[PDB]
Design a protein around this motif. Structure first.
Motif, mmCIF file in Angstrom:
data_model
loop_
_atom_site.group_PDB
_atom_site.id
_atom_site.type_symbol
_atom_site.label_atom_id
_atom_site.label_comp_id
_atom_site.label_asym_id
_atom_site.label_seq_id
_atom_site.Cartn_x
_atom_site.Cartn_y
_atom_site.Cartn_z
ATOM 1 N N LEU A 46 0.870 -1.260 -0.030
ATOM 2 C CA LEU A 46 0.013 -0.179 0.148
ATOM 3 C C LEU A 46 0.884 1.248 0.167
ATOM 4 O O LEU A 46 0.634 2.412 -0.820
ATOM 5 C CB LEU A 46 -1.004 -0.004 1.351
ATOM 6 N N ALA A 79 1.025 3.691 -3.102
ATOM 7 C CA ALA A 79 0.836 5.379 -2.698
ATOM 8 C C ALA A 79 1.812 6.295 -3.123
ATOM 9 O O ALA A 79 1.625 7.309 -3.804
ATOM 10 C CB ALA A 79 0.158 5.596 -1.275
ATOM 11 N N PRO A 89 3.056 7.864 11.868
ATOM 12 C CA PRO A 89 1.797 7.628 11.615
ATOM 13 C C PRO A 89 0.862 8.676 11.040
ATOM 14 O O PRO A 89 -0.158 8.561 10.626
ATOM 15 C CB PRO A 89 1.193 6.821 12.598
ATOM 16 N N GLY A 90 1.207 9.962 11.859
ATOM 17 C CA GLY A 90 0.483 11.018 11.680
ATOM 18 C C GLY A 90 -0.265 11.705 12.679
ATOM 19 O O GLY A 90 -1.191 12.388 12.555
ATOM 20 N N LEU A 140 -16.475 3.166 14.725
ATOM 21 C CA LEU A 140 -17.133 4.404 14.699
ATOM 22 C C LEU A 140 -16.002 5.675 14.179
ATOM 23 O O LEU A 140 -16.670 6.431 13.111
ATOM 24 C CB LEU A 140 -17.504 5.158 16.055
ATOM 25 N N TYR A 141 -14.963 5.508 14.526
ATOM 26 C CA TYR A 141 -13.717 6.292 14.010
ATOM 27 C C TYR A 141 -13.850 5.980 12.247
ATOM 28 O O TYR A 141 -13.746 7.034 11.641
ATOM 29 C CB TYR A 141 -12.532 6.286 14.569
ATOM 30 N N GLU A 160 -16.046 5.023 10.365
ATOM 31 C CA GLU A 160 -17.110 5.689 9.616
ATOM 32 C C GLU A 160 -17.151 6.764 9.543
ATOM 33 O O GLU A 160 -17.416 7.697 8.686
ATOM 34 C CB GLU A 160 -18.284 4.977 10.797
ATOM 35 N N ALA A 161 -16.690 7.653 10.612
ATOM 36 C CA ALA A 161 -16.483 9.262 10.620
ATOM 37 C C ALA A 161 -15.542 9.671 9.519
ATOM 38 O O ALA A 161 -15.621 10.640 8.831
ATOM 39 C CB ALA A 161 -16.276 9.691 12.062
ATOM 40 N N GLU A 182 -16.663 9.279 5.997
ATOM 41 C CA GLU A 182 -17.545 10.302 5.702
ATOM 42 C C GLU A 182 -17.006 11.663 5.443
ATOM 43 O O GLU A 182 -17.404 12.527 4.573
ATOM 44 C CB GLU A 182 -18.760 10.472 6.719
ATOM 45 N N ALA A 183 -15.815 12.103 6.194
ATOM 46 C CA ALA A 183 -15.271 13.418 6.141
ATOM 47 C C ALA A 183 -14.444 13.217 4.675
ATOM 48 O O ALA A 183 -14.627 14.272 4.120
ATOM 49 C CB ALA A 183 -14.220 13.604 7.191
ATOM 50 N N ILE A 226 -7.049 6.748 0.681
ATOM 51 C CA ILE A 226 -7.048 5.778 1.883
ATOM 52 C C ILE A 226 -5.981 6.115 2.808
ATOM 53 O O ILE A 226 -5.975 5.896 3.971
ATOM 54 C CB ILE A 226 -6.514 4.137 1.332
ATOM 55 N N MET A 227 -4.724 6.566 2.084
ATOM 56 C CA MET A 227 -3.623 7.106 3.017
ATOM 57 C C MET A 227 -4.072 8.230 3.956
ATOM 58 O O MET A 227 -3.655 8.621 5.061
ATOM 59 C CB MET A 227 -2.528 7.234 2.061
ATOM 60 N N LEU A 230 -6.190 6.885 6.697
ATOM 61 C CA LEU A 230 -5.429 6.395 7.894
ATOM 62 C C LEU A 230 -4.835 7.355 8.605
ATOM 63 O O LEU A 230 -4.781 7.256 10.121
ATOM 64 C CB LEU A 230 -4.315 5.472 7.232
ATOM 65 N N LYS A 231 -4.212 8.433 8.216
ATOM 66 C CA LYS A 231 -3.734 9.549 8.935
ATOM 67 C C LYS A 231 -4.849 10.203 9.945
ATOM 68 O O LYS A 231 -4.518 10.441 11.200
ATOM 69 C CB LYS A 231 -3.090 10.540 8.304
ATOM 70 N N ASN A 233 -7.086 10.941 15.500
ATOM 71 C CA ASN A 233 -8.414 10.732 16.260
ATOM 72 C C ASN A 233 -7.983 9.971 17.488
ATOM 73 O O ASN A 233 -8.423 10.305 18.581
ATOM 74 C CB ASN A 233 -9.433 10.329 15.476
ATOM 75 N N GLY A 242 -8.889 18.815 13.529
ATOM 76 C CA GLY A 242 -8.094 17.401 13.307
ATOM 77 C C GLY A 242 -7.776 16.979 12.069
ATOM 78 O O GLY A 242 -6.581 16.544 11.632
ATOM 79 N N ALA A 259 -22.297 10.948 11.313
ATOM 80 C CA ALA A 259 -21.110 10.570 12.370
ATOM 81 C C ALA A 259 -20.514 11.770 12.956
ATOM 82 O O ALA A 259 -20.064 11.723 14.274
ATOM 83 C CB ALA A 259 -20.241 9.563 11.932
ATOM 84 N N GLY A 260 -20.069 12.582 12.209
ATOM 85 C CA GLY A 260 -19.215 13.832 12.626
ATOM 86 C C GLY A 260 -19.783 14.600 13.776
ATOM 87 O O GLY A 260 -19.000 14.920 14.690
ATOM 88 N N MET A 320 -18.737 12.504 16.931
ATOM 89 C CA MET A 320 -17.438 12.774 17.087
ATOM 90 C C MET A 320 -17.435 13.847 17.897
ATOM 91 O O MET A 320 -16.452 14.073 18.873
ATOM 92 C CB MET A 320 -16.911 12.556 15.911
ATOM 93 N N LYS A 329 -15.771 14.543 21.783
ATOM 94 C CA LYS A 329 -14.708 15.308 22.069
ATOM 95 C C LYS A 329 -15.184 16.228 23.118
ATOM 96 O O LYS A 329 -14.378 16.698 24.050
ATOM 97 C CB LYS A 329 -14.142 16.242 20.792
ATOM 98 N N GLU A 366 -15.267 20.059 13.742
ATOM 99 C CA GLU A 366 -16.028 18.922 13.342
ATOM 100 C C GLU A 366 -17.179 19.338 12.516
ATOM 101 O O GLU A 366 -17.544 18.831 11.467
ATOM 102 C CB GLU A 366 -15.783 17.818 14.127
ATOM 103 N N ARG A 420 -18.310 21.341 8.842
ATOM 104 C CA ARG A 420 -18.403 20.617 7.551
ATOM 105 C C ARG A 420 -19.784 21.002 6.953
ATOM 106 O O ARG A 420 -19.973 21.118 5.797
ATOM 107 C CB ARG A 420 -18.105 19.072 7.567
#
Lengths: 164, 164, 164, 164, 164, 164, 164, 164, 164, 164, 164, 164
Positions: F31, F35, F138-139, H31-32, H34-35, H38-39, H124-125, H128-129, H134, H146, J121-122, J125, J129, J155, J158
């Motif tokens: 991955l 990327a 990781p960020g 949940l993280y 999912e959020a 969406e973002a 995807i990258m 992940l960040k 979060n 964030g 979801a936002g 979240m 927080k 958050e 958006r």
């Protein structure tokens, strides 16, 4: 190309103060060497031993008779011109270390260098600095361009011949 | 070239206090010496030992009758003109420390030095500092423009002929 | 010249406080002294007893007849000129402490200064400061001319008399 | 010059607290004392005890008749001017601390001091500070204009007499 | 002069926190005292007990008849002025503490103090401050003028009286 | 593409010194490599090397006849033109490094790269640096624009070639 | 003088917490006291106990007849004017609280203070602070204008209330 | 949508280096994720597989007929308009990647996309960040948004189509 | 006046946390209180009980007849004027809280209070702060006025609120 | 209202890692949840689950039929106008995401949400927080605007949508 | 005044942590309380305990008929004006919290609530903070305008009623 | 008022996180609660459960008919005003939350809240923060208004509805 002859691995290791290393393999260093040489090529445009033929669609810049070549011509040898109805060959004596000549249009010449021994030392001095920097900066933290902060670009700058 | 007679390796080692380090072989010191002398020649413009014969074309720079050459001639030997369809070759005495002309076209002269003892001490002093800097700092850290920060360049400035 | 008569090595060692140095031999300290004296002479222009001759071509400056030579003739016997169309040479008395005279033309003269002991104390102090600075700086600094930062050039300034 | 009478070596050794130090021989202290007194003479412009008598050319500055002297004549007795077509020698008395007189032309007078004890104590105090600075700081550190930072060139400023 | 009575060594030592000093000898303190007194005299112009005869060429200042002298004459005894075209001698008493009079020429008078006891205490305090400063600054440390930072000049300032 | 041929996982593991780390499996390195290569392709715009001639659509830009192409034609093999209202073939010599041609419209030319080893080492170095940055950060810290601060982005700037 | 009754030494020692200190004799403290009162008198302008009759010259300030004397007046004995066009002392009555006379020429008055008791407490407090400052700091360190930084001067400012 | 297919949870655990977390359970990581997805969708505009139908009213814009719909139809499938007193319904083909059409009225359409496989790596990258940020900032530390500080929003920027 | 009736010493010793002082005797603290109350009186303008008569001359002010007296007469009792060539004395009622009356002339009056009861609370707090500051600042601290830095002059400000 | 079905207490406790802390009872967490949801509703403007019918008076903001209403209408049900002397009530379709339409007077409509599953979801979240911030910061120190520094507010941004 | 009913010493002792400290006796605490309450009255201009009745003179501010009161009456019962040509009763009620009435002249009125509950808790809160500051910081230190830095003068600002 | 129901002491202790206090008695916290509620009252202007009557005059603002009231009348029942209009007294119901109405003049009405349960949670959250801040800082340290830095005012700000 036989980069080994241009710059041996042993000298690179000695200059970088990395002749006692537990994980840096020669196979990887052979990549940094090639990368540094390619970077020098791009920055200065001076090709190494392999000479290259140049035939390009030259043009006149202005009524003053100014013609710009893409690369400096082989030193000393006159440069020939043909095309545009001028069936007979035409040639002039070019300026050394320059790419401007004066009278579709066509022209030809060759660029390159004799052999490994004709490379100026400053190029090698900058290259070695660049390899040292790349060895001591895998890219994990900032401590901003690599080719400039290492100082190699400044060493090569002496040959870029900006207008006097 | 016989750079050894100009600055023996023994003196370089003595200055750098590294005569007992096996990490600095003879080849590396030779490379450093060559690079330092090349940089000094480029900066101060003083051609070194070889007496090279120089021939290059010219163009009439201005309507007033000014022409310029690329390298400094040696005093005494006249600069001669040939070719270009002119009336006949012409010989002129060179203005020392200058390469400007007063009255394609060609001209030729000689550049170099007759004896190697004529090297001023300041050049050697600066070269020593530059080589000392290059021996210690490989350029892989920031704590790199050796020619400036090492102080060698400023020593040579005594000769770069600022306009009075 | 016999610099050893003007500044014994023992005096330099007593000044710099280096009467125990474990690596600085006399062969390098003599080179340092030579370079420092050369720098002082170049900066102030107060040359020494030995003399040299020069020949050069010249050109008049203005209608008033002021002429400039490349180096200061000795404060004494005449300065000779030759050529200029006339069938016999012409000679003028050169004004001391200056290179300017008052009326192609060729010029010749002799350079040098008067008796050896002319050196005052300030120049000696400046030379000592420069040598002391040079001993303890082979070149490493992030913590830039040696003659400026060391204060020697402020000791020699008293003899320049600049008019702006 | 015979500085031994003006400032005994004993006083210098006592002020700098170095009478038990074998690393500062009489030669070095003599050199420092001579250099310091030379600097003082250059800065303040008063020649010391030797009763020097001057004869210097003077030309009227402007129609108003102002004439400027290069040294302050001794106060209490006249200063004489001669030459310049004067009918007979003429002498006046100057205003004290005045180096200008007004109602080829040559002017002469005596400038000096009666007794060495009249050497103003400020001059000796500045010389002591300069010598103390010189002994302790050879000039290879950044913790170098000794004449200023030591205060001697400020201790001497009281006399230079800028225009009121 | 009787400096020992104006300011005894014992008081100076007590003020500057000196019960007994390892190396500071009384002879040097006697020089410091004289230097401080000379500095005070130069900064204020208030000559001490020895009354002084002054003779100098005076001039009229402006359209208003304003007259100025080098030093303040004694407060109550006349100044004299004769020569340069005067009709008869005439002596007058000046303003209190102000050298201003109103309607070659030579004028003379006497200035000074009645006795030792007339010295205001402020001058003594400033002299003590300056002496204390000089005892603790031989001239070797930077991390500037001595007479100002010590604060003595501020104490003396109360008597110079710039225009109101 | 089959990235396994361009950059084996072994080189990435060696450069980042993580071949003994079991927390970074082949799935995650795939991955990261994908990327990084996609980011480089988006940045420099040089799609990688399945050898391929070029034929693309174009529309004239202005009355001058300027037309902008996508990629640089190779030197020494003329472009050919078709499409639109043209009824006959035509071939013109391309200018080196150029991407604009002048006399819907069609035209094809030969360009690109032949062998995977021709992938310039700079791109590989940038990819390695970006992957090394991604592995260790990781960020979720501030001690995060990975492409830039890691220096990989700077290595790719040699090619984008802003207008000269 | 009567300074003893104004401020007994016991109070000063109690304030400065130095009664048990043999390192500050009585004479030095008396000198401090005298200097403190002198500075206070100069700053605030309040003449102390010793009454003095004043006779000083005057010049007519303006065409309006204004004349200003030198020192502040006490309730004031009548003023007698002599000189000028008056054959006998011209008696007149002055007024207090101002140094202005408005209806060579002489004028007179008296100034002082009859008793010690009226010395306001603020003056005593300021003198105590100044003496305390002077006892501790001899004036040879920086981290020295005692009258200002010690805070004594600001206490006395209550009584001036200048009009600008 | 089946996010677990696009990004296995173990992948997130490996990237954030949290394969030993003591209190972060999977019910919260879901949940993280999912959020974060969406973002990303809101930012870049690239939706996710499931489609949805929409109905809305519109207001007459202007003469040129440019009309704005509240959402982007799918793949250009016909978008119908009804009501508003029109004689009969009219239908147009909507331009993809936009919500603008060329001609109270009612409009209806459907939104969505084709398949999951068309998700590039950069998104995807970035996700992940965002997830890693979060996890390690529950909301009780200050060390503005964030998605910005973590650098995720600097990865998606490559698809947001700035104007060239 | 009997300050002990207004403020016991025990109150000070309680306020300034100095109920253990073995160096600050009561005699000095009484002087501190005496000075502090006087300073408060000067700042606020609320003169204290001890009454005192005053006599002064006054110059003619202007047409409108406003005349300024040097002090504030006691409220509600006549202020007298005499002399100045008037036929007979004239008397006016003085306005309280002011020193201005509405019409060499002589004037007399008296000032003071009734008794000690006219002391509000805030003045006490200001005096307490001033005394506490004075105790712990003997006058050798720099590592700037006493009454301002302590805040007492900010406590007393409430009773002015002038139109400034 | 049933906030439990939207965000069970178990999830909040799991996020804040305080499930085993007896210092935070259920009532306090319920209060925090209610406050956070209220703040989110106020900020993002998205009316929450409980549907409510709204009737309020209107006054058109301009002269060309601009209708403005306090709260956003819900989709589907038209907003109906009543009273105000109308010929008969009038119904308008709700323009999505706005409450301003093109036409004392009365109007009414209904707002709310059909189901609780539509919460993005936002929002959750951000609420998490904010609750986490409130749990760990009572607001009595400064390292307190929880809504901003905790990151919850950004958050929700958006959805707020800017006016374009 | 009888402050014992407004704020018992017990509350001050409990808040100011000093309910067991023997240093702070009843007298000093009573002094602090009285000073704080007086400061509060001055800052807010609102007598707390008695429901005082005021009779004050009034002059018409301008022809508009504006009259400005010094206190704030209550809404429900009038405030009376008298004097001048008014032959009949005249009393009005102003805008709430407004001290201005729109139509020698005399006015009187009384307002407020029944009991001491009209001493709002904010004033007591400010008094407590001011007393707490006063007890701990005597004023001989810097880290002193207590009324501000303690916040009391900020707590009292709610009632100051900026002049809108 | 029985504030206990609005906000129990136990909840305040749990939030301010102080259920171990050794000296903070419940009686003082009961005063803090009342002070905080008064602060909220003064800031936002909304009263609590006790509904109260309001009587005041209402001067018209402009010809447009704009009239404003001190407090928002109850949402649903009329405000009354007598005279100043058509033939009968008239009462109208105002805008929601906006105290603006449009057509002697004494007007009265009622305002308040239904019950203790209608208070929005944000008010309670702000009150809790202010209470905690007051508990932490009794007034000694400076670490500037207490109602703002605590953050409660920011929580209450959402309801104050600045003018558009």
């Amino acid at each position: 190309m036989n980069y080994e002859t241009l710059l041996p691995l042993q000298t690179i290791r000695e200059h970088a103060k990395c002749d006692d290393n537990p994980r840096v393999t020669d196979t990887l260093l052979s990549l940094y060497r090639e990368a540094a040489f390619e970077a020098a090529e791009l920055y200065t445009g001076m090709s190494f031993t392999p000479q290259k033929t140049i035939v390009e669609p030259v043009r006149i810049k202005n009524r003053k008779g100014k013609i710009v070549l893409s690369q400096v011509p082989i030193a000393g040898r006159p440069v020939v011109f043909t095309g545009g109805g001028l069936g007979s060959p035409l040639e002039l004596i070019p300026f050394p270390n320059s790419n401007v000549l004066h009278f579709q249009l066509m022209a030809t010449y060759v660029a390159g260098r004799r052999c490994e021994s004709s490379v100026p030392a400053g190029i090698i001095m900058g290259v070695l600095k660049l390899i040292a920097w790349n060895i001591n900066n895998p890219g994990d933290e900032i401590m901003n361009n690599g080719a400039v902060v290492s100082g190699a670009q400044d060493e090569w700058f002496r040959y870029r011949r900006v207008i006097l």
